[PDB]
Structure formats: structure tokens, C-alpha cells
């Protein structure tokens, strides 16, 4: 069992990395929002000039 519990200890670590891989996906959806706010409003002001 001592070697056993060492094995399942690794799956828990593999769980943590998978959650972080989901976290970077949250960072990915920042891209469209970042590219939306500052710069899509400017394209509405180009016609105002």
C-alpha cells in the first residue's frame, strides 16, 4: 500500500495541471474582450470625423 498511495499521488498532481490548462483558457477569452473594448470603439469614431 505504501507504493500504492505513491501511485495515486501522481493522478492528483495530473489533476492540478489539467485545472491550470482550463485557467489559461480563461486567459484566452480575455483576448476578444481586450480587443473589443479599446479598439472596436475607435472604429466607431472613424466615421464621426
Amino acid at each position: 500500500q505504501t507504493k500504492k498511495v505513491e501511485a495515486e499521488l501522481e493522478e492528483n498532481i495530473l489533476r492540478k495541471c489539467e485545472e491550470e490548462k482550463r485557467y489559461e483558457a480563461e486567459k484566452e477569452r480575455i483576448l476578444n474582450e481586450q480587443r473589443m473594448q479599446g479598439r472596436f470603439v475607435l472604429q466607431q469614431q472613424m466615421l464621426e470625423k
Partner: protein, 431 residues
Amino acid sequence: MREVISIHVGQGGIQVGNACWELFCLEHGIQPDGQMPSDAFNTFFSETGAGKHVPRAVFLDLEPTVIDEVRTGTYRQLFHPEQLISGKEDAANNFARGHYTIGKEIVDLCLDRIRKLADNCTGLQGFLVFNSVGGGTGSGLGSLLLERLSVDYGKKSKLGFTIYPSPQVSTAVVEPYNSILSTHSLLEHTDVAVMLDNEAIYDICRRNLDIERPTYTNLNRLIAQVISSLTASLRFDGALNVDITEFQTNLVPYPRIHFMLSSYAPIISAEKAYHEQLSVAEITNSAFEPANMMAKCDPRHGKYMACSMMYRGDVVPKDVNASIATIKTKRTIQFVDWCPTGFKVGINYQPPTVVPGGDLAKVMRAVCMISNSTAIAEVFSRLDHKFDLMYAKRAFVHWYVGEGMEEGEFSEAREDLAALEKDYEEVGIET
């Protein structure tokens, strides 16, 4: 090491080339004077050794008007000075003038420049040619160039982006005469041809772009986007890449049937593009909406043969296949029986570029679609009726005869269009 040569002949070709080359320069970051401020561009441009870049384009005309506009415009330092060929006398809406009288003294220079450009290339994929068909030098020089390049090169593919007249909105009065003639010459010399009727793009500029007074500049910007979306697979990285040679292997069932029409989506102004998400699910549905077609033709009047979709942006391959099944199961889109699989899809990662001072909005995902369908037979039928009505009483025929054109050539062009119509009619039926 893959290149492509673009040929601009006639006023329409030149004025669409101005916009397309502005878009290419903006996309690749090259300044108007040719310098790059501090390897993918090799498809369109060529290095001078230290600094500026010279496009692989040649401009042809007989009127020195639009050429002199380029030679003194902001792009005067970009193009090679002695590949902006200009003539002295205009063809003046006469097909025989640009094919028998005043085109023979100028076609020699264009061939030499094309040979010089090709000798510099190493992986030449093919040729792009833009020309207005309802005109004299556009149809006259366009036929001669294709005829010469055929016997000069052979197996190099040629892509033509022509502008046929609208069903009811057109300028010239003799354009049914020369539109028929040029189609005869390009049918057996062009591998892929695209229909770009003017009236269709006017309506697209209205409904989507909220523009009440469109102009030729607005239309030419739409075509440049289509060209860029078509050729971005050569010069940008993507999950699924498609070459020029991988166009005429999936869209042309038979060697004669290669006249096709295009569409683009999404087309929308920025004032209302940000009230909705523009997901891949619907932008692929809009591409098949008949009102969004770039040629004034109704796809509901015939079957489909083969459809090509080129996605660019951040599309996911799973999402693409999920939307395609919806199109297949839709009951108002009908494919021909002998084509079970009808889609060839390519995906690119580069998002579409936006030109300052334009009218379009910028979106995360864009699809450009090229479809070959039997509905393209109606534009030939309606074009034939006008020519028959005029040729019954033989109007304007004396203008063409006196320039060296035989009387009997008008009949031969008429007969082969009938053959093409019969070919479409016999191929559209089921087994």
C-alpha cells in the same frame, strides 16, 4: 518559394488592382514607398536586395488616363516604373480594336514583361487576371493575352476574376456584342473564372453596410477581401491548407464547366456588428443566403455541384463540421445526385485585416465561399436574348466589321454559348 503573378488589364482591372494592392501592402506591413519599417510576403512581393519590395504585378491599358493616375499617386514609387504599360488610342468599347488593330502592337511588350517576371520566380503556382468584360480593351486584350500565354506556358493554371454586366443596370449599349465574344475565347483558355456582376455588390453594400450612395471604390474593396481570403492559405499558417492547384481539382467536374460564382461573410458595419456575437454557426449560414451572393443569380433555381469554404480566424475544426451537417440536412439547398460529398474546407489562423478609411467592420471569423452550380446557366440565357434582339436587325455591326473582324465570327461565338447552355442542361439532370 511559391509565387503568383497578377495581370491587370483595362480600367476595371486597374481600379480593382489599386485597392487589392493597397490591401496587400497594409496586410504585409509594407509602406507605400516600398520600404519595410523596423518571408511570408514572398508570394506577392520580391526583394530588391536591400530595402524596398517590388510587387509581381503588371498594369495594362490603352488610355494613358488611369495609368497616369497611378504614376503620380501615392503609390508612384512602389511599382516597377516600366511595367505600367500605356498606349495612345483607346479601344473605345470596340472588341475588334483591342484584338485585331491596336492590341497587336502592344501585346509584345506585355509578353516580354511576363516572361521576365516568370524567369525570376521559381515555384510559380499560376496567374491571376482581372478584366472588365463588357468593354473593348478589357475583352480584346484579355482574350489575346490568354491565347498567347496558353501556347507560351502550357500547364500553369490561370485564374480569372471577370465582371460581367448586370441583368438590367449597365452603362454601354453595345456590351452584349463583345461579352459573348470574349466568353468564347476565355472558355477554352481559363481554368477558373469567377462572376462579379456589379448590381449584386450594390445591393450587398446597401443591406449590410448601411450605405445609401455606394461608389466603385466601395465595390473594389469587397473584391480585394475575397482575393486576400482566397490566397491567404499560401502565405499564412493554418490547420488545413489549400493551394491554387488544390482548387481546380475539387470544383471542376468537367473541363468545360468551370464558370463559378463567389460569396463572402460576414459583411457588416461596425455600428451594429458589436450587438451580436458572429459565431461560426451563423456566418456559414449567411454565406449560403441567396441575397448575399456576389453575382446577380438565384442558386435556388438549380442544383449545386461543389462548394469550397475557406475559413480564417480562430475557427475550430469540430465546429465547422457541425455546421456543415446542418447545411446538408437543410431542405432548401439541393446538391446533384452524383456528388455525395460536396465540400472542400480550408482553415487559416490569420484574422481578416481592416483598411483605415473603409466601411467594413472587423470580426474574429470570416468565411469566403466559391460554389459551382447549374444556376449559372441563367446569366448566359439572359445575355443571349439581348444579343439575339440586336443581331436580328444587325445594329452596330458595321463598327466591328471595319476594324478587321470577319462577319462570320459573330455567328460562331453565338453557337458555342448555345452548346454551353445545352451542356449545363444535360449535366444538371439526374441519372
